[PDB]
């Protein structure tokens, strides 16, 4: 097969390629922070990196972070409006390869 948009002589990559955004919460939602222990997201991210950075690919580490935040945390507030709420981190990957912190 052949076409007008593939196999260019000069190899190029998108200027937006190879970026990964690890957001603490889903689009359009508040993000939670404990005034004493820190944010649910960063707490969880550091814990998962400390435990899996020399064992798992980054996306899989971040997936563990998603689960930890989603299952272990729930807000506490004297304001009923902000009480008993949940959070799910949001992994946005425009990476083109797997990423391992070790080699």
């Amino acid at each position: 097969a052949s076409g007008v948009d593939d196999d260019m002589a000069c190899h190029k990559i998108p200027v937006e390629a190879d970026f990964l955004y690890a957001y603490s919460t889903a689009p359009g939602y508040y993000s939670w922070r404990n005034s004493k222990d820190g944010s649910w997201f960063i707490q969880s991210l550091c814990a998962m990196l400390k435990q899996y950075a020399d064992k798992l690919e980054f996306m899989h580490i971040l997936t563990r972070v998603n689960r930890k935040v989603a299952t272990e945390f729930e807000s506490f507030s004297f304001d009923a409006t902000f009480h008993a709420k949940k959070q799910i981190p949001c992994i946005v990957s425009m990476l083109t390869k797997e990423l391992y912190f070790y080699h």
Partner: protein, 147 residues
């Protein structure tokens, strides 16, 4: 040599790379923004975590929108040739697509553009990670019981 796949980023450069942590805890009274108690715990945790991954961690506290842009611009102009990747952690108040300096908002796009494949050549083809602890809106998740 044998079969080469290239399915994972080359992370064996002399340096893992920089890990820039912008920790905004105190905001100018003029903004009406409240302090972010507990963020220092996050900044310290991140410093230790990335230190152990062999990243060159640089922390900055309470930066204005101007300082944030200047910091990002300066960092993006460094020679990252011997670095495997780049990491930036943003801890602050925010809204969708925006991160707040101590005196006002900064478009996330303005920060990330400095590192575009065509604007930071020494990072072209290398992973650029942005970790963001900040609000992305005002919706609340009521959650659901699990069975």
């Amino acid at each position: 040599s044998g079969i080469s796949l290239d399915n994972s980023y080359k992370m064996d450069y002399p340096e893992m790379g920089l890990c820039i942590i912008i920790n905004n805890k105190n905001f100018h009274k003029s903004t009406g923004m409240t302090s972010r108690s507990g963020t220092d715990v996050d900044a310290a945790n991140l410093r230790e975590t990335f230190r152990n991954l062999k990243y060159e961690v640089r922390n900055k506290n309470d930066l204005t929108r101007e300082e944030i842009v200047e910091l990002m611009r300066d960092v993006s102009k460094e020679d990252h040739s011997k670095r495997s990747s780049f990491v930036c952690v943003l801890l602050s108040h925010g809204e969708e697509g925006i991160i707040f300096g101590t005196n006002g908002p900064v478009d996330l796009k303005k920060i990330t553009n400095f590192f575009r494949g065509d604007r930071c050549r020494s990072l072209t083809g290398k992973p650029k990670l942005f970790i963001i602890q900040a609000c992305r809106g005002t919706e609340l998740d009521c959650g659901i019981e699990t069975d």
